[PDB]
Scaffold this active site. Structure first.
Site, PDB file in Angstrom:
ATOM      1  N   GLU C  33      -9.169 -25.360  20.230  1.00 31.44           N
ATOM      2  CA  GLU C  33      -9.897 -25.342  18.965  1.00 31.44           C
ATOM      3  C   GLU C  33     -10.582 -26.686  18.716  1.00 31.44           C
ATOM      4  N   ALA C  34     -11.903 -26.669  18.564  1.00 30.42           N
ATOM      5  CA  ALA C  34     -12.667 -27.898  18.345  1.00 30.42           C
ATOM      6  C   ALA C  34     -12.658 -28.417  16.914  1.00 30.42           C
ATOM      7  N   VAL C  37      -8.152 -25.124  12.635  1.00 26.98           N
ATOM      8  CA  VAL C  37      -7.468 -23.927  13.096  1.00 26.98           C
ATOM      9  C   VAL C  37      -7.682 -22.828  12.062  1.00 26.98           C
ATOM     10  N   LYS C  50     -12.874 -15.568  -1.443  1.00 26.32           N
ATOM     11  CA  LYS C  50     -12.058 -14.612  -2.182  1.00 26.32           C
ATOM     12  C   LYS C  50     -11.322 -15.325  -3.314  1.00 26.32           C
ATOM     13  N   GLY C 173     -30.829 -13.611   0.201  1.00 24.80           N
ATOM     14  CA  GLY C 173     -30.046 -12.695   1.018  1.00 24.80           C
ATOM     15  C   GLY C 173     -29.184 -11.768   0.182  1.00 24.80           C
ATOM     16  N   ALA C 176     -23.248  -9.396   1.958  1.00 22.73           N
ATOM     17  CA  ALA C 176     -21.989  -9.717   1.293  1.00 22.73           C
ATOM     18  C   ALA C 176     -21.865 -11.174   0.841  1.00 22.73           C
ATOM     19  N   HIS C 437      -1.002   9.627  -9.898  1.00 25.17           N
ATOM     20  CA  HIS C 437      -1.758   9.654 -11.145  1.00 25.17           C
ATOM     21  C   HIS C 437      -0.992   8.826 -12.179  1.00 25.17           C
TER      22      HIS C 437
HETATM   23  C1  FAD Z   1     -18.901 -17.243   3.222  1.00 26.62           C
HETATM   24  C2  FAD Z   1     -18.369 -16.174   4.157  1.00 26.62           C
HETATM   25  C3  FAD Z   1     -17.558 -15.166   3.658  1.00 26.62           C
HETATM   26  C4  FAD Z   1     -17.040 -14.145   4.513  1.00 26.62           C
HETATM   27  N1  FAD Z   1     -16.234 -13.182   3.940  1.00 26.62           N
HETATM   28  C5  FAD Z   1     -15.738 -12.204   4.739  1.00 26.62           C
HETATM   29  C6  FAD Z   1     -14.874 -11.170   4.183  1.00 26.62           C
HETATM   30  O1  FAD Z   1     -14.550 -11.119   3.020  1.00 26.62           O
HETATM   31  N2  FAD Z   1     -14.408 -10.205   5.049  1.00 26.62           N
HETATM   32  C7  FAD Z   1     -14.751 -10.215   6.433  1.00 26.62           C
HETATM   33  O2  FAD Z   1     -14.299  -9.337   7.096  1.00 26.62           O
HETATM   34  N3  FAD Z   1     -15.529 -11.152   6.957  1.00 26.62           N
HETATM   35  C8  FAD Z   1     -16.038 -12.149   6.175  1.00 26.62           C
HETATM   36  N4  FAD Z   1     -16.826 -13.110   6.727  1.00 26.62           N
HETATM   37  C9  FAD Z   1     -17.131 -13.098   8.188  1.00 26.62           C
HETATM   38  C10 FAD Z   1     -15.850 -13.576   8.969  1.00 26.62           C
HETATM   39  O3  FAD Z   1     -15.515 -14.878   8.495  1.00 26.62           O
HETATM   40  C11 FAD Z   1     -16.135 -13.592  10.471  1.00 26.62           C
HETATM   41  O4  FAD Z   1     -16.465 -12.277  10.898  1.00 26.62           O
HETATM   42  C12 FAD Z   1     -14.888 -14.063  11.249  1.00 26.62           C
HETATM   43  O5  FAD Z   1     -14.511 -15.420  10.849  1.00 26.62           O
HETATM   44  C13 FAD Z   1     -15.219 -14.022  12.736  1.00 26.62           C
HETATM   45  O6  FAD Z   1     -13.954 -14.504  13.581  1.00 26.62           O
HETATM   46  P1  FAD Z   1     -14.195 -15.108  14.944  1.00 26.62           P
HETATM   47  O7  FAD Z   1     -12.761 -15.295  15.507  1.00 26.62           O
HETATM   48  O8  FAD Z   1     -15.043 -14.360  15.747  1.00 26.62           O
HETATM   49  O9  FAD Z   1     -14.917 -16.390  14.771  1.00 26.62           O
HETATM   50  P2  FAD Z   1     -14.784 -17.703  13.882  1.00 26.62           P
HETATM   51  O10 FAD Z   1     -13.843 -17.493  12.751  1.00 26.62           O
HETATM   52  O11 FAD Z   1     -15.984 -18.293  13.678  1.00 26.62           O
HETATM   53  O12 FAD Z   1     -13.948 -18.682  14.710  1.00 26.62           O
HETATM   54  C14 FAD Z   1     -14.468 -19.346  15.920  1.00 26.62           C
HETATM   55  C15 FAD Z   1     -13.571 -20.594  16.123  1.00 26.62           C
HETATM   56  O13 FAD Z   1     -13.903 -21.145  17.442  1.00 26.62           O
HETATM   57  C16 FAD Z   1     -13.979 -22.617  17.292  1.00 26.62           C
HETATM   58  N5  FAD Z   1     -14.821 -22.964  18.445  1.00 26.62           N
HETATM   59  C17 FAD Z   1     -16.152 -22.660  18.629  1.00 26.62           C
HETATM   60  N6  FAD Z   1     -16.629 -23.103  19.792  1.00 26.62           N
HETATM   61  C18 FAD Z   1     -15.571 -23.724  20.398  1.00 26.62           C
HETATM   62  C19 FAD Z   1     -15.444 -24.412  21.698  1.00 26.62           C
HETATM   63  N7  FAD Z   1     -16.421 -24.544  22.561  1.00 26.62           N
HETATM   64  N8  FAD Z   1     -14.186 -24.924  21.965  1.00 26.62           N
HETATM   65  C20 FAD Z   1     -13.133 -24.809  21.095  1.00 26.62           C
HETATM   66  N9  FAD Z   1     -13.160 -24.197  19.889  1.00 26.62           N
HETATM   67  C21 FAD Z   1     -14.405 -23.668  19.579  1.00 26.62           C
HETATM   68  C22 FAD Z   1     -14.547 -22.777  15.919  1.00 26.62           C
HETATM   69  O14 FAD Z   1     -14.350 -24.084  15.465  1.00 26.62           O
HETATM   70  C23 FAD Z   1     -13.753 -21.752  15.130  1.00 26.62           C
HETATM   71  O15 FAD Z   1     -12.582 -22.202  14.538  1.00 26.62           O
HETATM   72  C24 FAD Z   1     -17.377 -14.174   5.915  1.00 26.62           C
HETATM   73  C25 FAD Z   1     -18.197 -15.193   6.439  1.00 26.62           C
HETATM   74  C26 FAD Z   1     -18.705 -16.201   5.594  1.00 26.62           C
HETATM   75  C27 FAD Z   1     -19.583 -17.273   6.208  1.00 26.62           C
HETATM   76  C1  FAD Z   2       6.534   6.713 -21.149  1.00 21.61           C
HETATM   77  C2  FAD Z   2       6.190   7.627 -19.988  1.00 21.61           C
HETATM   78  C3  FAD Z   2       5.441   7.142 -18.931  1.00 21.61           C
HETATM   79  C4  FAD Z   2       5.093   7.969 -17.824  1.00 21.61           C
HETATM   80  N1  FAD Z   2       4.334   7.404 -16.810  1.00 21.61           N
HETATM   81  C5  FAD Z   2       3.994   8.181 -15.750  1.00 21.61           C
HETATM   82  C6  FAD Z   2       3.187   7.633 -14.661  1.00 21.61           C
HETATM   83  O1  FAD Z   2       2.784   6.489 -14.634  1.00 21.61           O
HETATM   84  N2  FAD Z   2       2.877   8.482 -13.614  1.00 21.61           N
HETATM   85  C7  FAD Z   2       3.325   9.846 -13.592  1.00 21.61           C
HETATM   86  O2  FAD Z   2       3.008  10.500 -12.644  1.00 21.61           O
HETATM   87  N3  FAD Z   2       4.056  10.353 -14.578  1.00 21.61           N
HETATM   88  C8  FAD Z   2       4.411   9.582 -15.658  1.00 21.61           C
HETATM   89  N4  FAD Z   2       5.154  10.121 -16.659  1.00 21.61           N
HETATM   90  C9  FAD Z   2       5.571  11.542 -16.580  1.00 21.61           C
HETATM   91  C10 FAD Z   2       4.344  12.445 -16.926  1.00 21.61           C
HETATM   92  O3  FAD Z   2       3.929  12.108 -18.246  1.00 21.61           O
HETATM   93  C11 FAD Z   2       4.774  13.903 -16.834  1.00 21.61           C
HETATM   94  O4  FAD Z   2       5.186  14.168 -15.496  1.00 21.61           O
HETATM   95  C12 FAD Z   2       3.603  14.835 -17.167  1.00 21.61           C
HETATM   96  O5  FAD Z   2       3.128  14.593 -18.529  1.00 21.61           O
HETATM   97  C13 FAD Z   2       4.095  16.273 -17.030  1.00 21.61           C
HETATM   98  O6  FAD Z   2       2.887  17.252 -17.352  1.00 21.61           O
HETATM   99  P1  FAD Z   2       3.153  18.643 -17.895  1.00 21.61           P
HETATM  100  O7  FAD Z   2       1.713  19.233 -17.989  1.00 21.61           O
HETATM  101  O8  FAD Z   2       4.056  19.376 -17.134  1.00 21.61           O
HETATM  102  O9  FAD Z   2       3.765  18.505 -19.238  1.00 21.61           O
HETATM  103  P2  FAD Z   2       3.424  17.688 -20.564  1.00 21.61           P
HETATM  104  O10 FAD Z   2       2.316  16.744 -20.323  1.00 21.61           O
HETATM  105  O11 FAD Z   2       4.534  17.292 -21.237  1.00 21.61           O
HETATM  106  O12 FAD Z   2       2.654  18.654 -21.499  1.00 21.61           O
HETATM  107  C14 FAD Z   2       3.196  19.932 -22.006  1.00 21.61           C
HETATM  108  C15 FAD Z   2       2.309  20.304 -23.243  1.00 21.61           C
HETATM  109  O13 FAD Z   2       2.793  21.605 -23.750  1.00 21.61           O
HETATM  110  C16 FAD Z   2       2.793  21.524 -25.226  1.00 21.61           C
HETATM  111  N5  FAD Z   2       3.751  22.578 -25.558  1.00 21.61           N
HETATM  112  C17 FAD Z   2       5.105  22.565 -25.313  1.00 21.61           C
HETATM  113  N6  FAD Z   2       5.712  23.675 -25.719  1.00 21.61           N
HETATM  114  C18 FAD Z   2       4.720  24.452 -26.253  1.00 21.61           C
HETATM  115  C19 FAD Z   2       4.749  25.795 -26.862  1.00 21.61           C
HETATM  116  N7  FAD Z   2       5.836  26.509 -26.990  1.00 21.61           N
HETATM  117  N8  FAD Z   2       3.523  26.267 -27.300  1.00 21.61           N
HETATM  118  C20 FAD Z   2       2.368  25.543 -27.176  1.00 21.61           C
HETATM  119  N9  FAD Z   2       2.255  24.309 -26.628  1.00 21.61           N
HETATM  120  C21 FAD Z   2       3.461  23.801 -26.179  1.00 21.61           C
HETATM  121  C22 FAD Z   2       3.202  20.104 -25.469  1.00 21.61           C
HETATM  122  O14 FAD Z   2       2.943  19.736 -26.792  1.00 21.61           O
HETATM  123  C23 FAD Z   2       2.356  19.349 -24.452  1.00 21.61           C
HETATM  124  O15 FAD Z   2       1.122  18.885 -24.891  1.00 21.61           O
HETATM  125  C24 FAD Z   2       5.542   9.338 -17.815  1.00 21.61           C
HETATM  126  C25 FAD Z   2       6.307   9.857 -18.884  1.00 21.61           C
HETATM  127  C26 FAD Z   2       6.644   9.030 -19.980  1.00 21.61           C
HETATM  128  C27 FAD Z   2       7.461   9.624 -21.106  1.00 21.61           C
END
Ligand code: FAD
Ligand code: FAD
Lengths: 40, 460, 460
Positions: C33-34, C37, C50, C173, C176, C437
């Site tokens: 590595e020049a 790293v 990022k 440009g 990305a 959900h």
């Molecule tokens: C601003 C910016 C943001 C980016 N963001 C993203 C992103 O979010 N996601 C993504 O996927 N890609 C991103 N990229 C692109 C990504 O960085 C490159 O695709 C990736 O670094 C390529 O890896 P590489 O191993 O081919 O080369 P490089 O990471 O360039 O590494 C080559 C290495 O070889 C060394 N080297 C070179 N010649 C020699 C030599 N003769 N002898 C010894 N060592 C040598 C260099 O010093 C260097 O460390 C971004 C690029 C830029 C510029």
């Molecule tokens: C605080 C809390 C957080 C939760 N967070 C999550 C989560 O993040 N992810 C997840 O997947 N699940 C979560 N759950 C569970 C989720 O809410 C339930 O699994 C989901 O609501 C079940 O859907 P359901 O349609 O079977 O019943 P319900 O949504 O309970 O709905 C039944 C409906 O029937 C009506 N009803 C009942 N009896 C009668 C009747 N005799 N006549 C007419 N209408 C009637 C009720 O009033 C109601 O509106 C959570 C539950 C709680 C309490």
């Protein structure tokens, strides 16, 4: 042709052209099993 | 008596999904709602909870932000936050109304009783249909010794942070609801202790990642007591004196809090519905029995979501609603999908598939791969990384079996894992997929690589 | 003469992945590595950019945060920011160094030069090996009429916000790099004007989602001039007077700014490497010629990353390093993967696979599905719901062809799309996957449903 990565990987390591391996899903998806099945 | 092709009881995630999907399939649909359109998720569950968490997180991150020159003296107005939370709910619930109307679904407000298989009564009037979908949801599960009242809150009351933040809060329940609300309150300035009866929080999920969440919560001052139960309490001049004891029993300790949040579970709302007289079978806990087609014991009557069976998740209810509608419409659908679970704390927790234990019990030759967030360049650019990704698979077939994540955006990253499972991906498939760099999603790819002992960003 | 099984030139994403994977395969490796790293990505590319984006987003969101009661008087110390940025970079490059050492890879600081297909010269010493991997990377491309200088910056100089922010900046440009650094400067207070020669920014990506990003950027006050080109400028008392003309030419125009950032591309560092001596061929653009195995025209000599071929992305370089190392190890690996690309602006943009145009041109009967974030529950709980997800598929086979996303976390959600493509997923598989959900990822599932006109949260 549709082959999951695991199957394509194994097909190569066996020297078997992946496009020659018959699938198994509802419509040709090649699985690791199929590649081995073709290998035998 | 007005008649329809289908009648849906409840407009919650499950209900409005069944109603809308049914409409798309050409059925004339009637949707009944006794309370607020949108159900629990949109009104007093998912939505308002996620909103509070986002505000709390925005406030919290400002501390770490000081590390990169962001100086500020934040002052969170709780009345305003409550207003926003309400505005968000109103938008979404109103949206569903609009959505139902746009699909030609008839919305009826009122409590519905099941008069019989093909009939239902609401506000006196009767209504008939060839198919009925029960989607009545659930409600907060009461806890012995801690009846709901002014000092003992359920999740619904806990959402109203503008009505008085308690100095000290006791949270009973180490599940998603308890963890999320506990963290919201902690970040809003209250002291918080959370107790869980099982050995670890998130008892159903992977213990290792769940432990990492617990330790992260404790770093924020949240006292998490596992293998502990609240026996009872007594209100006194200075607060609620609560008696805690080890789960298996023993010498207890006493703590004093101002308010208690009971989030030990949920109860299906299937009582006083007539399910009994209509021949619809309900189990020991009140959940409507159903098969994979969401069909009850009565032909033509389906049950979905929280009222039908655990896990009590919104996306699960939504999909069951689609399955039910499709079968009512005459198709041949069944529920057989991987269902992920997410906890929106910070860090977040997400899981899908089999835990190491469930996998082993299933007879697979279990093998796992782990990648810590401390090695994630993205995580560092985000202000610091604590968390990890764990992949569970079979070492003989290389088949992915389960994925568990703890860290920022875990909830977003688990969908890839879910797709992976549905597509029958192997660990190699996951490792060979080119994930964009730098991203948190790379941790999944690297975890898959760690599974084969060739991760690059950590020593194997 | 010291000898090894493999000699890697460069320690950027490609170089260190090759070096490490090669060591895991039991090879004796020397990494040269020049400079710093970790290469470009860790020192002056991915990472520092990022970090700046995250600080900017944290700051910018406080405006919106006022909506839910968060009142603050934010002041961003640019010296501290620059400090944190340097800390992140140092932490990660130190990490790579620790990783190389922990894997038994020898690190030699210096500039390597090829003397033969199996020998290299460094500072005067001779090092040889059976295989050589060329990972020299790229550098900023210079624009005619805008030679780099005190007032004309390349991305590297643009990163140093602690050295003072210009009041007015011109970015040349629309890729990305320009979009990201332009938004960082705008968010830090500078007036910004970005010019893109092509009809739309991100000319290689989906114009529909790209246009949504451009519009969001304009809404923040960034003036985006598409179909425009900067011809030159002259330094005057009040600043730099830059001349602008339509892409094809015509009525000249003038804009006055304090500084110019040139981000029009990169140039591969393949000169003075002693290539034109070992037989290794390069094309007209300067890229080392390689096949799918990453093999150059000289057996045993491989080339990867920015020095081998576009796109100039990190994850791509990393995978190519793995391919090259496995092949130097006597295996048989080849690159045939879907490469996603992300823009870390707010909203983020991400894409993978074929655009509508490329798919139609390739002969697929194209059909698209779209889901707007305005319809996303999760997006609302996060504040503003700006963005959309677009899936491109084959109407005849239902096969997924491409995915484009603009919105928060777009970069994390694109991995699921990449996996979908790698697994040969159909739009139905995408739709059948139960997404958590409420999450932003759900937008991908609903986009798949829209493609079949059966989305639930929007009218079909
Ligand atoms: C601003 C910016 C943001 C980016 N963001 C993203 C992103 O979010 N996601 C993504 O996927 N890609 C991103 N990229 C692109 C990504 O960085 C490159 O695709 C990736 O670094 C390529 O890896 P590489 O191993 O081919 O080369 P490089 O990471 O360039 O590494 C080559 C290495 O070889 C060394 N080297 C070179 N010649 C020699 C030599 N003769 N002898 C010894 N060592 C040598 C260099 O010093 C260097 O460390 C971004 C690029 C830029 C510029
Ligand atoms: C605080 C809390 C957080 C939760 N967070 C999550 C989560 O993040 N992810 C997840 O997947 N699940 C979560 N759950 C569970 C989720 O809410 C339930 O699994 C989901 O609501 C079940 O859907 P359901 O349609 O079977 O019943 P319900 O949504 O309970 O709905 C039944 C409906 O029937 C009506 N009803 C009942 N009896 C009668 C009747 N005799 N006549 C007419 N209408 C009637 C009720 O009033 C109601 O509106 C959570 C539950 C709680 C309490």
């Amino acid at each position: 042709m549709l082959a999951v990565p695991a199957a394509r990987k194994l097909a190569r390591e066996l020297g078997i052209p992946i496009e020659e391996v018959p699938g198994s899903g509802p419509l040709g998806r090649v699985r690791v099993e199929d590649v081995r099945a073709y290998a035998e | 008596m007005k008649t329809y092709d289908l009648i849906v009881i409840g407009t919650g995630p499950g209900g409005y999904h069944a109603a809308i999907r049914a409409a798309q399939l050409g059925l004339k649909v009637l949707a009944v709602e006794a309370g607020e359109v949108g159900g629990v998720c949109l009104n007093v569950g998912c939505i308002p909870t996620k909103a509070l968490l986002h505000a709390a997180e925005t406030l919290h991150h400002l501390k770490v932000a000081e590390g990169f020159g962001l100086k500020a003296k934040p002052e969170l107005d709780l009345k305003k936050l409550g207003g926003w939370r309400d505005q968000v709910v109103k938008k979404l619930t109103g949206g569903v109304g609009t959505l139902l109307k746009g699909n030609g679904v008839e919305l009826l407000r009122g409590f519905a009783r099941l008069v019989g298989p093909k009939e239902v009564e609401v506000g006196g009037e009767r209504y008939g249909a060839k198919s009925l979908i029960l989607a009545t949801g659930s409600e907060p599960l009461e806890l012995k010794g801690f009846p709901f009242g002014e000092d003992v809150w359920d999740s619904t009351r806990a959402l109203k942070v503008e009505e008085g933040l308690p100095k000290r809060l006791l949270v009973i329940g180490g599940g998603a609801v308890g963890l999320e609300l506990g963290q919201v309150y902690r970040r809003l300035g209250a002291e918080v202790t959370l107790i869980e009866y099982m050995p670890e929080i998130l008892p159903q999920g992977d213990p290792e990642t769940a432990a990492l969440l617990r330790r992260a919560l404790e770093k924020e001052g949240i006292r998490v007591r596992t293998k502990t139960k609240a026996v009872g309490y007594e209100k006194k001049k200075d607060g609620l004196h609560v008696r805690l004891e080890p789960a298996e029993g023993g010498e207890g300790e006493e703590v004093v809090v101002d308010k208690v949040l009971v989030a030990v579970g949920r109860k299906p709302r299937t009582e006083g519905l007539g399910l009994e007289k209509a021949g619809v079978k309900v189990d020991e806990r009140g959940f409507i029995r159903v098969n994979a087609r969401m069909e009850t014991s009565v032909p033509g009557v389906y049950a979905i979501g929280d009222a039908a069976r655990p896990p009590l998740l919104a996306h699960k209810a939504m999909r069951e609603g689609l399955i039910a509608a499709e079968n009512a419409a005459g198709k041949d659908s069944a529920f057989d999908y991987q269902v992920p679970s997410v906890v929106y704390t910070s860090p977040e927790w997400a899981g899908v598939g089999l835990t190491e234990e469930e996998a082993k019990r299933a007879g697979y030759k279990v093998k796992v791969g782990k990648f810590p967030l401390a090695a994630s360049g993205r995580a560092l650019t985000l202000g610091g990384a604590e968390g990890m990704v764990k992949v569970v698979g079979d070492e003989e077939t290389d088949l992915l079996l389960g994925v568990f994540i703890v860290g920022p955006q875990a909830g977003e990253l688990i969908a890839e894992a879910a797709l992976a499972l549905e597509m029958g991906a192997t660990l190699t498939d996951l490792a060979l997929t080119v994930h964009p760099h730098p991203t948190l999603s790379e941790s999944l790819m690297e975890a898959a690589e760690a599974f084969h002992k060739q991760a690059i960003h950590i020593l194997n």
